[PDB]
Scaffold this motif. Sequence first.
Motif, PDB file in Angstrom:
ATOM      1  N   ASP A   3      -2.130 -34.950 -26.917  1.00  0.00           N
ATOM      2  CA  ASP A   3      -2.872 -34.324 -27.994  1.00  0.00           C
ATOM      3  C   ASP A   3      -2.039 -33.279 -28.709  1.00  0.00           C
ATOM      4  O   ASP A   3      -2.423 -32.108 -28.835  1.00  0.00           O
ATOM      5  CB  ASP A   3      -4.204 -33.777 -27.481  1.00  0.00           C
ATOM      6  N   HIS A  62      -1.168 -33.418 -31.959  1.00  0.00           N
ATOM      7  CA  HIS A  62      -1.769 -33.162 -33.259  1.00  0.00           C
ATOM      8  C   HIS A  62      -0.827 -32.665 -34.332  1.00  0.00           C
ATOM      9  O   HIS A  62      -1.209 -31.780 -35.123  1.00  0.00           O
ATOM     10  CB  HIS A  62      -2.939 -32.183 -33.136  1.00  0.00           C
ATOM     11  N   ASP A 118      -3.384 -38.943 -29.680  1.00  0.00           N
ATOM     12  CA  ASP A 118      -3.546 -37.973 -30.768  1.00  0.00           C
ATOM     13  C   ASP A 118      -2.243 -37.275 -31.122  1.00  0.00           C
ATOM     14  O   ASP A 118      -2.148 -36.062 -31.103  1.00  0.00           O
ATOM     15  CB  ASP A 118      -4.665 -36.996 -30.469  1.00  0.00           C
ATOM     16  N   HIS A 178      -6.959 -39.983 -33.628  1.00  0.00           N
ATOM     17  CA  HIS A 178      -6.383 -39.300 -34.797  1.00  0.00           C
ATOM     18  C   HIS A 178      -5.181 -40.018 -35.394  1.00  0.00           C
ATOM     19  O   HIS A 178      -4.757 -39.700 -36.505  1.00  0.00           O
ATOM     20  CB  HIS A 178      -6.034 -37.862 -34.463  1.00  0.00           C
ATOM     21  N   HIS A 185      -7.630 -36.864 -25.069  1.00  0.00           N
ATOM     22  CA  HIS A 185      -8.890 -36.830 -25.798  1.00  0.00           C
ATOM     23  C   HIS A 185      -9.679 -35.548 -25.580  1.00  0.00           C
ATOM     24  O   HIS A 185     -10.045 -34.896 -26.556  1.00  0.00           O
ATOM     25  CB  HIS A 185      -9.742 -38.063 -25.456  1.00  0.00           C
ATOM     26  N   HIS A 228      -8.863 -32.536 -24.261  1.00  0.00           N
ATOM     27  CA  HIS A 228      -8.126 -31.241 -24.342  1.00  0.00           C
ATOM     28  C   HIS A 228      -8.597 -30.282 -23.260  1.00  0.00           C
ATOM     29  O   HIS A 228      -9.020 -29.136 -23.548  1.00  0.00           O
ATOM     30  CB  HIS A 228      -8.307 -30.522 -25.692  1.00  0.00           C
TER      31      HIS A 228
HETATM   32 FE   LIG Z   1      -7.080 -34.743 -29.690  1.00  0.00          FE
END
Ligand SMILES: [Fe+2]
Lengths: 271, 271, 271, 271, 271, 271
Positions: free
Chosen positions: C8, C10, C50, C81, C195, C197
């Motif tokens: 994640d 991002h 992500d 994402h 997913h 976090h």
């Molecule tokens: Fe995420």
Amino acid sequence: MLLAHISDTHFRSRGEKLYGFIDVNAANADVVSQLNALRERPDAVVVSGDIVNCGRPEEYQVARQILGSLNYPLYLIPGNHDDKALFLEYLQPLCPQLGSDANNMRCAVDDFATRLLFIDSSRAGTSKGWLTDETISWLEAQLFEGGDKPATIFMHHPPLPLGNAQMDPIACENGHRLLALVERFPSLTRIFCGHNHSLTMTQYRQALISTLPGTVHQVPYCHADTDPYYDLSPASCLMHRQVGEQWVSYQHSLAHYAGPWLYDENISCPT
Amino acid sequence: MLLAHISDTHFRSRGEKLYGFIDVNAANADVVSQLNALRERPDAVVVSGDIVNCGRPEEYQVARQILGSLNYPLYLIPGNHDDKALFLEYLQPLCPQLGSDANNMRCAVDDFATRLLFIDSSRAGTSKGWLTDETISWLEAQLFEGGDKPATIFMHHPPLPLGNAQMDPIACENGHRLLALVERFPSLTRIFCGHNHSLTMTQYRQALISTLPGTVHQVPYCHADTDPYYDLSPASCLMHRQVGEQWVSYQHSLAHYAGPWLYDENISCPT
Amino acid sequence: MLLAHISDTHFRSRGEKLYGFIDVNAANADVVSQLNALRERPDAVVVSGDIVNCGRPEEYQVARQILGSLNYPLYLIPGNHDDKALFLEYLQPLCPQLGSDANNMRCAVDDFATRLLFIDSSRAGTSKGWLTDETISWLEAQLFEGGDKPATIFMHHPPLPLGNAQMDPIACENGHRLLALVERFPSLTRIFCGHNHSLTMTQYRQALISTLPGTVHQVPYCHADTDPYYDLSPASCLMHRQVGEQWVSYQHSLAHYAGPWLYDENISCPT
Amino acid sequence: MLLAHISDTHFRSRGEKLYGFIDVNAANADVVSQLNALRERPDAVVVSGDIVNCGRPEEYQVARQILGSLNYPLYLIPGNHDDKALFLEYLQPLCPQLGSDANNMRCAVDDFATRLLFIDSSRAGTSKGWLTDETISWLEAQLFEGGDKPATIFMHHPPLPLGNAQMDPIACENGHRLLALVERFPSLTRIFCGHNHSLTMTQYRQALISTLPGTVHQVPYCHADTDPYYDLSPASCLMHRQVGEQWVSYQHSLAHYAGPWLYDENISCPT
Amino acid sequence: MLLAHISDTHFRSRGEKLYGFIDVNAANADVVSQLNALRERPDAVVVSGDIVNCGRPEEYQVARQILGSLNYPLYLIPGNHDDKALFLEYLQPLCPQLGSDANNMRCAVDDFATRLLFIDSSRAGTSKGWLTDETISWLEAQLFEGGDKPATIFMHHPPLPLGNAQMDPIACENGHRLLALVERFPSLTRIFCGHNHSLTMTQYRQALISTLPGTVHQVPYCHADTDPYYDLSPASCLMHRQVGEQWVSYQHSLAHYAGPWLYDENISCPT
Amino acid sequence: MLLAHISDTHFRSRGEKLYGFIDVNAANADVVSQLNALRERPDAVVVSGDIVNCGRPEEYQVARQILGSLNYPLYLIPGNHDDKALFLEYLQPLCPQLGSDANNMRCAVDDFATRLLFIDSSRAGTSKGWLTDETISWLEAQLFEGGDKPATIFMHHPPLPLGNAQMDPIACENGHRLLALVERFPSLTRIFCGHNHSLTMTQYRQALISTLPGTVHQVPYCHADTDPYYDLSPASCLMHRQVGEQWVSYQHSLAHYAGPWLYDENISCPT
Ligand SMILES: [Fe+2]
Ligand SMILES: [Fe+2]
Ligand SMILES: [Fe+2]
Ligand SMILES: [Fe+2]
Ligand SMILES: [Fe+2]
Ligand SMILES: [Fe+2]
Ligand SMILES: [Fe+2]
Ligand SMILES: [Fe+2]
Ligand SMILES: [Fe+2]
Ligand SMILES: [Fe+2]
Ligand SMILES: [Fe+2]
Ligand SMILES: [Fe+2]
């Protein structure tokens, strides 16, 4: 004489951070505003090399803007991370005394009680330092024609090994030629260096020789480990002040810290 | 030779803080643990004076416990905040070479390539330093017997004015006595001091003279402002290392900071 | 086997911060330099989806540069994402085993004592997870043809509800099909997920199932509140090590914190 | 069922800090107040051993006051830093089910869908864990009477090597005794431990086995380095929640961090 | 009525930081997400001027995006750092009541128990404030035709000197004309101002008059020193709530700080 | 007239922390030193109640030492956490004008252009405020003799509801008694309060009424949530300055923050 002396700014281009995460441009713009905010204002600011990180034009554009926002005369010298031609193109307007030959950037300043000598120890294609034939000679001319007035040299690379496992192999390779000048010239009493990102000092004869911390990231001194470490331990600079016959250097922290408060005898030792 | 050199610990009694808010006892215990955790382990730790803050027995009990927990031989000297008699009663078991006489605490160490000379510049009833004639003649005898072997002196008070408006009036008042000895003995090449709570360095002939940062609170260098400031700017110590025929001093940060990471050329200058 | 496992990330595009204020690109470049600086070096780094925030080409450019600066083989899988086509275009060069069909990115690794299975649970047009018919089948083929060698699955979405009010409605919608595989195949003993976090773990039969913290921002577990919270609580990753018969996962903090120091009996319990 | 699970509080006596600088008493009081301030309130708080640091009566007085201020039923077990007799004298009023016998402290809780089994792995005169035969037969009887109802065990020392070079030699020395019980009883599905000051998890058959972070200082996982490190990396606890037929454990940060904010799709991906 | 009231955002263009080092765009995007995350949601957000730093179109683009991401109706007024024409072009879509004459941006709101009056005190070509002939008149029309309903004015510049050496010379130059309106109109009971980057309050007759802190950088109040200081002391905003007959303003900190916890009598005063 | 106005110090006994983790004694000692270090030195320091936390003699010993170390005349009033008798025994030597009678502690100061009225709103056996009739008639007599000379009142409890769900039920219960006096006396123009641990201001006729932040911990303003929250959001005090015929109050941050720097137009808007 009061000099603020910073080193190893390592500017990156406008959108960019050093290693992707260290905001050197912001950290340096903070340092610049700290210097302009000083209550006791220096006569000049010295930046002893590694001005940009990659020797790229866009980094020099940033350096020019941020260093150009200093409200002080500037003495700028290159380090191994600098490009000579671009350093001259972008920064000579901020330090005109450099000259217009990118291979022979040097200047003597004698506005003060101590002569200041600024040299380029950087060498194209290597991290090691080198004093050119012409630099060694010009240095000796300054000291030979300079009589009894003390002299200080600012250069990027330390002219001797300091026992630092990471940094010694990349010190000034013929630095022993400069040590020959300190042996021969009693007036040469200070050599200040960047490169090491660390306050490390020694004396050779009558000369105090010191490296400076960087304005942003530091490198720890290891005697045995050659792993190329850097960290974000507190940044600082050196103030150089002439105090009668004495050149004194004091560390000026560039961190944001609590204080100051005032000492009070009753608070110090309550009854 | 590797020495860790801290000073101006300013220990308070158990459960007290300096000025009621600076937890000097905790901060120094953190420092002691940092020094025990060093990868390159020193041969000894020097503490250059102002061990306690008020010269009180209960402060020495704290100093004895915390400094006693260092896993190294210690060399301890007093500062003006110390009490000579209590310093000897509590700390002499940690530094047996001080002796039995509170008025003549000093010792020579000949284990290393450079001889180490520890002296007491503190004077009862004042903040100012004083070098007694018995200290000076002991020094003369040490330096004369020593011959060509280099010597460093550790003392609390700087032996000359450094231009610090707060600290100059309370420097070693008769520091000329020591300056005269550096003129006499080309062998005497370092003088390291506490008192100033600041890294400030100078050179007198062949001698490098430096004050150290404190382990906790610092004092800023002001040239014209006389206000007794202290702050909580970053603490550090000096490491002293014999490197060939060079005595080298490097700053070791006592702060907790981000890093280290490793330098990588692709991350440095991405394409 | 030693695996560093982050999730994640991002990434945002080059000038941009997540939500305008969270510097994910810098935070991730710090994490990357932390991983390259490890003393005990992983055999591979896993990034469980992500990877970018908006599924935009310019975010993938940043991700490619920063993840590409890892000095480790990479196993990369998408999250909701991510954009499948762009993920493949930009990141398959960093993880060639993904294949060249953006709708069927999957790979088995058996260099190690435990088989590693990397799958795509992301579904176009939704935040929920979905295991495609072909993914479920390929998973069952790996386990059916894999005999007694243990297996671990890496996927973005948790295959079961965890009681997290924000994250449960958007877990893997047919995750019960994967639970059917753990019931049927004793060799399937680990399922690691992004997913959420958040470090949240449970066991189903012989399988330990865990979500990971993000590298930057976290999401708190709420049982009742559905408000879409995120915070900047400390980031970390999971190290996975094979220790004899045991797969052990330990949390490796990615924050910058004080320490370490060394435990000492005398300092622990003073007398 | 909701449980808050902390461990390795390491309380010191009033006015002392761990190692002289880690304010464990303040940090744990902060934690206690965080747990009383929870919005989703636990049914009970578990503390999995090393309640005090030196096994001293005055440390138990602090532990009793601070843990006694939790607005929850407590389940308390000892670690190696505890003293069995003093632990019972001071803490049994907070956890009456421990009993009257300091050598046989253990209890079963049947309030929830999963039965909770609290045991003493600490052994006088060592850091290593030990499961007495009386503990093992009590466990056998509990697991046999329990039938198909799932069970979790709380103990201080992990019952198997986790590959942690510092912690493995002082794990539960005869942990095979407990591993044999997970083989015997498919009902036994969680074992949660303190001791390691680290979130490190593994699976043995149907059992998830996890150590917890400490409430204050942590110990890093090293596979090959034997140095007794501890640091001040972020503290947390584990929340344990029964979610349908799933026991789920999630990490709850005990640090003070920025946030939370709310996710907004327009702020996430601006156009 | 609940109003969140922020001031002096000083947005910079997309790649840029204020003074090169203060990330106002990120700090403001954090503030915006804080406001959207409020549990007790304001009816409207007020931004009392200096919206951008340089009056440049690219700064307005940033301001439009970030302020436009607020999930609240907005009342925006300019300060001396704003450009009237660009302020109208970029921000009138976010506050339509401003009008379409950049020289006469003003609006009255009476959705609430207290009338709200929003004016432009900014003057082209100066840092000083000026109330135009037409502004003074429209203000008097609002109060004359407004009967007994209380009124509050929002304007950028304070309408009277506050003794602040930096900020007084650049207050509203004909602010005494507004004071004439408070003397004449008992219904005018609040005047809230930006400009000063400081919470400073006074009363004139029945009117409480207050400046606000900035969202990012602050300016300290000095009575004698005219040096143009700014610092990064904690940012905050004012919440304005109607509580029966009382307009109450409370400071809402925008910093990230530890807490909250819950007060408990037993923890407060232990026995 | 310059006044520094702090409140809600909540001193604990020596070696104790508020709630076991907030070091109020250290934090207030830091504050005292900040106030002694001010460049613009106040004429006096006001402390508006809740001096100690539990009304214990040993807390007053700490308060007496720490407040006694302020290098200013003090004006001290009690809050509900105070004990009237002990407050007088310990603190009256610091504020002689309080008197000899613990039930009627109050005083008038006529040194400045505005008269200062210090009163006791604390009531034994409750958190709520109470204005005794003897306080009200003393106030009537003060305000009547005072004539046209403006007056400010300092009291612990706000005399009206501010809409704070936690604080309103424990405001001054009979605050109407003071509101009636502002209606009577146009001279009474400020009422400053502690108790709320928050800067919250309002206006009643010609009177500005404000509560102050605490010196350490704060309480957030909630309109609908009744939970007794406190946090460690930034602490400050109020400076009160007579500026011509204006009484002006400005917030002085007690936090340690970065800066100040100096504003420079070229650095503000680079070209
Ligand atoms: Fe995420
Ligand atoms: Fe460099
Ligand atoms: Fe360099
Ligand atoms: Fe000192
Ligand atoms: Fe001293
Ligand atoms: Fe996701
Ligand atoms: Fe422990
Ligand atoms: Fe333990
Ligand atoms: Fe402004
Ligand atoms: Fe302005
Ligand atoms: Fe209070
Ligand atoms: Fe109160």
